[PDB]
Amino acid sequence: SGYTPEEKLRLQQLRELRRRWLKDQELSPREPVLPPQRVSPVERFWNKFLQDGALWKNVIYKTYRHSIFAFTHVLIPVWIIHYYLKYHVTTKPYTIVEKKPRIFPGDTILETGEVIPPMKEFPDQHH
Amino acid sequence: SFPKYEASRLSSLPTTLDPAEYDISSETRKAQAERLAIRSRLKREYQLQYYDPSRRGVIEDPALVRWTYARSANIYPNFRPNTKTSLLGALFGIGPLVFWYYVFKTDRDRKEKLIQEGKLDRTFNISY
Amino acid sequence: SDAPPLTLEGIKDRVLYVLKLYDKIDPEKLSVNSHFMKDLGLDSLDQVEIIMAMEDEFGFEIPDIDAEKLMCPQEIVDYIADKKDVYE
Amino acid sequence: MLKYIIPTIMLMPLTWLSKNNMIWVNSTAHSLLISFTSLLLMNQFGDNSLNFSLLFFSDSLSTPLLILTMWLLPLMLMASQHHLSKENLTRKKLFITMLISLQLFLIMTFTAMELILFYILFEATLVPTLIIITRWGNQTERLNAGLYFLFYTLAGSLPLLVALIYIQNTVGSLNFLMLQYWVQPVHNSWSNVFMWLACMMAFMVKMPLYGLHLWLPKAHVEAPIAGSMVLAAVLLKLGGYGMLRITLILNPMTDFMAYPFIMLSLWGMIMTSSICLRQTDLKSLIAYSSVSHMALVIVAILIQTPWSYMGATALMIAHGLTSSMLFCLANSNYERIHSRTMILARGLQTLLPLMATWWLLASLTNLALPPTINLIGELFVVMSTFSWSNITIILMGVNMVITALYSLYMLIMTQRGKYTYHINNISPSFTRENALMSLHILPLLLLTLNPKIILGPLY
Amino acid sequence: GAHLARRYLGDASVEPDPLRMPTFPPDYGFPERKEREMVATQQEMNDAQLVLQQRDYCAHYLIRFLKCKRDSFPNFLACKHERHDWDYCEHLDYVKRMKEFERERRLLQRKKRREQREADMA
Amino acid sequence: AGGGAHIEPRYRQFPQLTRSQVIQAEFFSATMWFWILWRFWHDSDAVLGHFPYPDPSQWTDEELGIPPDDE
Amino acid sequence: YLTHQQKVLRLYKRALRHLESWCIHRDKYRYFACLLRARFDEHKNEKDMVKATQLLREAEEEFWHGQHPQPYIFPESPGGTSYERYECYKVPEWCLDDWHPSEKAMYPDYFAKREQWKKLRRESWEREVKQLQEETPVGGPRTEALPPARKQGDLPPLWWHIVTRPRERPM
Amino acid sequence: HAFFKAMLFMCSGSIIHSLNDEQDIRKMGGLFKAMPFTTTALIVGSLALTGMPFL
Amino acid sequence: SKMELPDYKQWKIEGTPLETVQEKLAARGLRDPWGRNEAWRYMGGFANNVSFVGALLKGFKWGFAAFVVAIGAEYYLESQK
Amino acid sequence: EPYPDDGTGYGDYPKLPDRSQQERDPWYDWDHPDLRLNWGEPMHWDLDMYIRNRVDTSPTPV
Amino acid sequence: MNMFSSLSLVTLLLLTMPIMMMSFNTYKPSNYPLYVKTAISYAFITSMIPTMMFIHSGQELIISNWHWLTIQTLKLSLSFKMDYFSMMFIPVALFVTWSIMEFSMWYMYSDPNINKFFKYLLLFLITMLILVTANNLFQLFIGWEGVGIMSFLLIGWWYGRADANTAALQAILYNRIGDIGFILAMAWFLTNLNTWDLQQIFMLNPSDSNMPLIGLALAAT
Amino acid sequence: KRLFIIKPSGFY
Ligand SMILES: C[C@H](CCC(=O)O)[C@H]1CC[C@H]2[C@@H]3[C@H](O)C[C@@H]4C[C@H](O)CC[C@]4(C)[C@H]3C[C@H](O)[C@]12C
Ligand SMILES: *C(=O)CCCCCCCCCCCCC
Ligand SMILES: [Zn+2]
């Protein structure tokens, strides 16, 4: 049932070829030949300064990455949104509708100072 | 021994249970030889063109072409009006149009009266 | 995905290793080039249960159209290398 | 409208007096300048339409169609360059001339204030559109597709000519502004029944209406790419524009005469959508899609509700950009494999990553993914028809299901899967093709931010 | 519960009809029952934005719970006592609901005995 | 992928482990039971009942108002 | 068609795999794996082709009733959970001829090696057609198997696509 | 629900990758000691879904 | 790096429940020539796998001690103030 | 075997078994692995319905 | 009110920033997967501020920032409804997505198109927060359809696998049937109540509601 | 051991 001599020889003929082909699908140590990409002063500054582990500074370096993120992604957008909401949205009727705050008995109101009577005396219970 | 397997339109009979994959007569195997004969020639013709390095483009497939011509262009010239096509055409074509005409016609007349008589509710209906 | 590749030698080593645990061959007489049906005295049903053991070793099925054409441990290594793209 | 008519005429002297190798650059550059100046027609008021003179006027319904028409001419020039490269220079100039005349007749048709002037120009579009199909089609079926297109229209146009003249002898004028004040109710007599048919069947054949649509799969398949874009983008919208105008003088007879054309349309959506599920030709599949989407416009116009007229106008603008984009995408493949069979080429997303993205966006708009204008118009028509009869939601919903299947079926069949092994000439996408698709989808997606300009007079 | 068998697998007139209750007069059988009073006022409940389902006699104790919730922030591991008082008050109100069901249950049996008594003797 | 230990893959043997892996894994399992036990200790009512459900039959007609059959 | 040894061999592997699906635990599978082998061992050889064919049909009928409703499948096999998963990363070889020269220069060595492969392909094409139009019956071939190169330095006919196919984990 | 059902899928992924893209549980077993951290999460999640008290 | 395969002979079906199968098959005159191949699954660090109840009881011993000591602090804390 | 000449416009197109493409020998070396077809093989009249994406007529366990 | 509203809209705007920067504005091919997760981490924190304020005093406000389209007597706006359901689900989705996003960096590290994979996940997250916070049906409908189509692209991620395409297309076949009910709900509310705003639906409680509710049940099925 | 990944032209 095995391979006939003609076939087993053909499979060997191709087998040598394929392994050579797969060997040719390899990259020389120089490749890829990237073009003259320039590095900014910030990129080269950190490469020189980050050579050593120096666990004491890795917190500082992490802070810079996060601090850069916070200002651009959390502080500028909130600035723009707040300016948009306070001076354009809230200048039109009912654009921002807010549920009136809950008023419990025995409370003081900031706007005028009204006081609501606490309650009628309760029939004290237990348990 | 075990209950027979019932083939269906959407459930074929397994090749193992088909009572024709065990007996192989002299003529039964003779035909199968030609099947792999004709289909072996095609595999040869395709591979002469597929592997050719001077060929860049599309290997036209006459089997594919005969398929579309039959599906689209060669239907009407082989159409004969008879009881089979005439009735199926009236049932599929005219049928549904008539059915939906009465469903919509009945409902709208029924709805119209409820507006003349005031029995319909349109209290907050000002977008139409 | 992080699984180390399979070298040509690694395929043979595990191929032979599995055969040695099959209680139908003499380990000393068992080399890479051994015909199951002509040298080591195995029946076809013995070879089939060798392929099933081989598939569960490398974790991939092999067709019965070709698995019924492997008659040597070396042929098994060639088939796996061809399928799994091993070159060195 | 002379500030657009005269510049369009001057495209012909420019094309014929230009150098041999700069005809595609001169015509494309200046036809884009005409399109830019068409934004001045957006000066619309909430009470009165923009009336220019005794002949021409523009309102919120004509303006979006005028902008779409002048926008397509530059696009059609780009798509025609590949298959005309080996063509004689003299004949390559006559091709560019037929398109210019087609634009000239179209802008004058969408602004004509007098219906007979509208009819003459409405009927003049057949001549250049026929020559494009019959002269510059590739297959042998173009000759027969030319006759089907020619005679289906005229068989309904000639009765329209009698009906329009009969109205003038009775009302005294066909000026559309006059007809808004002198219109009189239509009594229920057998004569008025046939007056209704004569006034509408010309516009039903061009939309087209299911049952009279056999010309579309022939004209939109055997026509070249330029012919297919204008055919499916503006020449179907002449039917819709006609009905939106001439229904002013058919009430209340439209209340009961519209029933047979609503069942052929509501049922025709399902039948034509279903046909797309088994088409073997990629260009044919896009054609049968036009029938399904144009069946909603017919329903919207015939029920005469403010929401339905806003939807119909938005449906026509949305479908013109989407339908044209699909034809362009189909032709880019044809320029490589030179066959329209849909299953011949598969797994194209492996070879052409960016052109596959255009396929995705083109498919989503076809199935009305919100908030695209495809969905805005299709939603309004579905909101208005529900008030007509709540049972219609059954038919509208079913078609939305079948639309998703065939829209995503052609995307999967050609873009996904495994590539054909013997198709070895799929060269990368040229900048022309990518620019051609981007000019279809970017303006379509931009109208979402300010959709009120394509909703029509009843907005 | 277990009464389901009686209502479905047993006699009907004995078991009440929750949809139609109450049936017998609110005062018959008792000597001028004292009306159940509510401490919380309509204006008071509105200012607390109490859900309608919570506008029950048990109100005026949920208002206590809310004030502690706001006056102990963040201390969600608190105000447990006020939670119990509102729970307990609902429990007492819930308990009385069973009493009406049980009271209504037997009063139906009386109508059976009295009607049976006159029917049987006559 | 990016980091982590570099434990080699055993061929047929039990895989290698690390100190932090087992301690951290074993830590959370213990914290689960402490939470269950502590939570059960202080609020066992929620998982065993809050208040006793009165038995309807043990009541008496006096607290219900069932008139005598005589009238 | 498929002879008689092949069917019983095919039928034997399925029984083990389907049985293996019920067993799950590896101690049980060996307990019944031998029995199944014994059941075939009962009717080994025995000649009498008419009786052997009759038994196999009953064996097939016996199998179908007992097949696992959800058989185990290897991930990278038809019906598995990874079949064709990596066909979306298998770009053909001819697509490299269309690269822009500005991006061929990033792999000067790889394309230099490609030139040799293409050069070999053109040179060897003529013989492979010669070799195939001589070692074939007059009425066209009757088998899908191809003959090898009956010489030294000559590549097997029709080798380009069988050799240069995409890798099984191309990315 | 989102917490422990999200956790269960992530923990299952750890099993699948470690077994050479194997999903069927008929070719698994003996992972209590091999993957303790996944084991702990697969058990914490397997109990929250069941509804163990106070989780 | 090179892979170091353990010795093939060390996998002995003895002790594992695989030889038991051979013993059970031997009771009817049958042998299974694969016991050793599966031997490694029942030996080494894979043997003595926990039971289902133990898996649910994981970490209870360590956790329980925290509970008893913790509640003791509460009792003392209540008395102090 | 041509289709019945009953006037439905089937012509002389070869009728073939209504077997879905999902139930063809998968391990074979098809010219179109996705479709399970060979160059020149006469395609079924309803081939686009039987592609592996749409309809499966394979034997069922029950 | 000023801090409550701003910290809720920034959450949604923050999630789109990685998508906006996909326009070759910042080119970090090897760090984009880490970029997206960091955005989700910062979105969880900002969402907690609105959540607490609803815990403290139960503050609820409605934002209608943009006037989009006005059809006769119907006015459509890009409204956001920050209430009980929005302020508790938003932290959970981001918290859970945060873990899935972090887990994906490990699981899909070898994928060649991991960059495209983290755009689709982020896009789905946006379409879920549009559905969650919608104050009108049309805005709710945009998110309802959006999550459907993103599920289609992610399910058929390995598009060479014919089984993936079938499962992807099948997932849009069933949701389209449900969409029939959603269109029915939009139709009934416009016809009879003359609105799509959730505020007006709850303020005109109709006695008869079997039809619109049946649509929602079909849609939710 | 980096290997060359064939991809369609990403320049155009
Ligand atoms: C903050 C995050 C991880 C930092 C860390 O290791 O802790 C890092 C990873 C990649 C960075 C981002 C990418 O560099 C892309 C953007 C361009 C600039 O780097 C600044 C903003 C920018 C948006 C960066 C913000 C921040 O520095 C990021 C998001
Ligand atoms: C009342 O509402 C009971 C409804 C049925 C729920 C309980 C079903 C199981 C009861 C079994 C215990 C029976 C009492 C011993
Ligand atoms: Zn071409």
String of DSSP letters for B49-106:
HHS-TT--S----HHHHHHHIIIIISSGGGB---HHHHHHHIIIIIHHHHHHHHHHHH
Tokens of G110: 């790889």
For residue E74, the chain K residue with the least C-alpha distance is: K56
Q: Give the amino acid at B58.
A: V
Is the separation of the CB atoms in D416 and D349 below 8 Å? yes
Q: Is A64 in the pocket of ligand 1 (CB under 6 A)?
A: no
Is the separation of the CB atoms in B50 and G161 below 8 Å? yes
What does the alpha-carbon distance between residue D322 and residue C86 come to, in Å, rounded to a whole number?
49
Is the separation of the CB atoms in E73 and K56 below 8 Å? yes
Interface test with A, best of G128, G136, G164 (most A CBs within 10 A): G164
Q: What's the CA dihedral at D180, D183, D189, D195 to 10 degrees? A: -50
Using a CB-CB cut-off of 8 Å, the residues of chain K touching G171 are 110, 112
Nearest CA to ligand 1 atom 4: A65
Give the count of alpha carbons within 13 A of G33, CB side only: 28
B57: left (phi over 0), alpha (psi -120 to 50) or beta: left
- Centre of ligand 3 from the C-alpha of residue B49, in Å: 21
- Centre of ligand 3 from the C-alpha of residue D347, in Å: 20
Residue D125 φ then ψ, to 5° = -70, -15
The label of the residue with tokens 């194997």 reads H22
Residue J3 sits at the vertex; the CA angle it makes with J2 and J8, to the nearest 5 degrees, is 135
What does the alpha-carbon distance between residue G81 and residue G73 come to, in Å, rounded to a whole number?
8
Q: Is E1 in the pocket of ligand 2 (CB under 6 A)?
A: yes
What does the alpha-carbon distance between residue K191 and residue K194 come to, in Å, rounded to a whole number?
6
Q: Which ligand is nearest to the CA of K28?
A: 1
* Closest listed residue to residue K18, CA positions, set K119, K154, K102: K119
Is the separation of the CB atoms in B1 and G61 below 8 Å? yes
Is the separation of the CB atoms in D201 and D114 below 8 Å? no
CB contact under 8 A, A102 and E60: no
Is the separation of the CB atoms in K163 and G83 below 8 Å? yes
Under DSSP, is residue G67 helix (H, G, I), strand (E, B) or coil?
coil
Nearest CA to ligand 2 atom 4: E1
What does the alpha-carbon distance between residue C14 and residue I44 come to, in Å, rounded to a whole number?
20
D225 burial level (CB within 10 Å; 0-12, 13-18, 19+): buried
Nearest CA to ligand 2 atom 9: E1
What does the alpha-carbon distance between residue D318 and residue D61 come to, in Å, rounded to a whole number?
14
Q: Which ligand is nearest to the CA of D430?
A: 3
Is the alpha carbon torsion for G73, G74, G77, G81 positive or negative? positive
Tokens of G99: 């690269």
The label of the residue with tokens 């990363």 reads G89
What does the alpha-carbon distance between residue D118 and residue D174 come to, in Å, rounded to a whole number?
10
Q: Is E26 in the pocket of ligand 2 (CB under 6 A)?
A: no
Q: Is A76 in the pocket of ligand 1 (CB under 6 A)?
A: no
Distance from J53 to chain K by nearest Cα, in Å? Answer: 6
D177 Cβ contact list (under 8 Å, min separation 6) = D51, D57, D113
CB contact under 8 A, K99 and H13: no
Is the separation of the CB atoms in H15 and H38 below 8 Å? yes
Ion ligand 3: residue ranges with CB closer than 5 A? D 335
User: Residue F37: in which H helix or E strand, if any?
Assistant: helix F19-42
What does the alpha-carbon distance between residue D411 and residue D415 come to, in Å, rounded to a whole number?
6
Please write down the long-range contacts of K191-194, taking CB distance under 8 Å and 24 or more positions apart. Answer: K191/B125, K191/B127, K191/B128, K191/D383, K191/D386, K191/D387, K192/B121, K192/B124, K192/B125, K193/B124, K194/B124, K194/B125, K194/B126, K194/B127, K194/K73, K194/K74
Q: Which ligand is nearest to the CA of K29?
A: 1
Using a CB-CB cut-off of 8 Å, the residues of chain K touching E73 are 55-56
Distance from G68 to chain J by nearest Cα, in Å? Answer: 8
Q: Is E8 in the pocket of ligand 2 (CB under 6 A)?
A: no
* Closest listed residue to residue D242, CA positions, set D273, D198, D283: D198
* Closest listed residue to residue E11, CA positions, set E19, E22, E3: E3
Question: Which one-letter DSSP state was computed for residue B4?
Answer: P
- How many beta carbons lie within 10 A of that of residue E94, not counting itself? 11
Distance from the first to the final alpha carbon of chain G: 40
- Centre of ligand 1 from the C-alpha of residue A101, in Å: 41
Q: Give the amino acid at B82.
A: N
Distance from the first to the final alpha carbon of chain D: 24
* Closest listed residue to residue C28, CA positions, set C16, C38, C36: C16
What does the alpha-carbon distance between residue D346 and residue D414 come to, in Å, rounded to a whole number?
4
Residues 110-129 of K with CB under 8 A from G: 110, 112
D329 burial level (CB within 10 Å; 0-12, 13-18, 19+): buried
What does the alpha-carbon distance between residue C61 and residue G76 come to, in Å, rounded to a whole number?
8
Distance from J17 to chain B by nearest Cα, in Å? Answer: 10
Distance from G92 to chain B by nearest Cα, in Å? Answer: 14
Residues 1-60 of J with CB under 8 A from K: 34, 52-53
Indicate the top mutation candidate among E3, E4, E6, E98 to test ligand 2's pocket, ranked by most ligand atoms within 8 A of CB: E4
Of G16, G74, G167, the CB nearest to C60: G74
CB contact under 8 A, G144 and B40: yes
Q: Which ligand is nearest to the CA of E2?
A: 2
Nearest CA to ligand 2 atom 1: E1
Q: What's the CA dihedral at D238, D243, D249, D251 to 10 degrees? A: 180
- Centre of ligand 3 from the C-alpha of residue D83, in Å: 6
Of D310, D405, D455, the CB nearest to K173: D405
What does the alpha-carbon distance between residue G43 and residue K7 come to, in Å, rounded to a whole number?
80
User: Residue K74: in which H helix or E strand, if any?
Assistant: strand K74-82
Q: How many CB pairs (< 8 A) connect C and G?
A: 35
Beta bridge partners of D51: D57
Task: For chain A, count helices (H), then strands (E).
Answer: 4, 1
Distance from J55 to chain D by nearest Cα, in Å? Answer: 13
Confirm or reject contact between F2 and chain K (CB < 8 A): yes
For residue C54, the chain I residue with the least C-alpha distance is: I37
Is the separation of the CB atoms in D300 and D239 below 8 Å? no
- The structure was resolved experimentally with cryo-EM
* Closest listed residue to residue D288, CA positions, set D269, D312, D265: D269
What does the alpha-carbon distance between residue H39 and residue H36 come to, in Å, rounded to a whole number?
5
What does the alpha-carbon distance between residue C49 and residue G59 come to, in Å, rounded to a whole number?
19
What does the alpha-carbon distance between residue C45 and residue C33 come to, in Å, rounded to a whole number?
20
> Which atom of ligand 1 has the smallest separation from the CA of K35?
29
For residue K167, the chain J residue with the least C-alpha distance is: J53
What does the alpha-carbon distance between residue H17 and residue C4 come to, in Å, rounded to a whole number?
14
Of G24, G73, G82, the CB nearest to H21: G82
What does the alpha-carbon distance between residue C65 and residue G6 come to, in Å, rounded to a whole number?
9
Helical spans, DSSP H, in D141-258 = 142-171, 176-182, 190-206, 216-222, 225-230, 237-246, 254-257
What does the alpha-carbon distance between residue B60 and residue J39 come to, in Å, rounded to a whole number?
9
Tokens of B72: 């689209």
* Closest listed residue to residue K153, CA positions, set D364, D325, D368, H7: D364
The residue ranges of DSSP E strands in chain F, in sequence order, are none
For residue A1, the chain C residue with the least C-alpha distance is: C69
Nearest CA to ligand 2 atom 7: E1
Is the alpha carbon torsion for G6, G9, G15, G20 positive or negative? negative
* Closest listed residue to residue D46, CA positions, set D65, D63, D59: D59
Under DSSP, is residue D421 helix (H, G, I), strand (E, B) or coil?
coil
Of F11, F12, F33, the CB nearest to I64: F33
Strand pairing category for K74-82 and K61-71: antiparallel
Tokens of D446: 């931009």
J38 burial level (CB within 10 Å; 0-12, 13-18, 19+): middle
User: Residue F31: in which H helix or E strand, if any?
Assistant: helix F19-42
Preceding omega of D208 cis (within 30 degrees of 0): yes
CB contact under 8 A, I21 and G35: no
Confirm or reject contact between B119 and chain D (CB < 8 A): no
- How many beta carbons lie within 10 A of that of residue D247, not counting itself? 19
Strand pairing category for K61-71 and A96-98: antiparallel
| Per-residue CA distances from F26 to D394, F19, F23, H53 (Å) | 58, 11, 5, 21
- Centre of ligand 1 from the C-alpha of residue K35, in Å: 6
User: Residue D271: in which H helix or E strand, if any?
Assistant: helix D259-276
Interface test with B, best of D214, D391, D393, D399 (most B CBs within 10 A): D391
What does the alpha-carbon distance between residue B106 and residue B84 come to, in Å, rounded to a whole number?
32
Q: D22-40 burial by CB neighbour count: b if 16+ within 10 A, else e?
A: ebbebbbebbbebbeebee
Task: Check if C85 is active-site.
Answer: no
The greatest distance separating any two alpha carbons of chain A, rounded to the nearest whole angstrom, comes to 108
Please write down the long-range contacts of H23-26, taking CB distance under 8 Å and 24 or more positions apart. Answer: H23/G75, H23/G81, H24/G72, H24/G73, H26/G21, H26/G24, H26/G72
D8 Cβ contact list (under 8 Å, min separation 6) = D34, D100, D103, D104, D107
Q: Which residues of F touch H (CB under 8 A)?
A: 14-15, 17, 21-22, 24-26, 28-29, 32, 35-36, 39-40, 43, 46-47
Residue D12 sits at the vertex; the CA angle it makes with D11 and D18, to the nearest 5 degrees, is 85
Tokens of G51: 């009786």
Tokens of D98: 């037929």
Helical spans, DSSP H, in D345-391 = 353-366, 373-388
Distance from the first to the final alpha carbon of chain I: 66
- Centre of ligand 1 from the C-alpha of residue K32, in Å: 9
- How many beta carbons lie within 10 A of that of residue H2, not counting itself? 12
CB contact under 8 A, J52 and K169: no
The subunits that touch chain H, with at least 3 C-beta pairs less than 8 Å apart, are: C, F, G, I, K
- How many beta carbons lie within 10 A of that of residue H51, not counting itself? 7
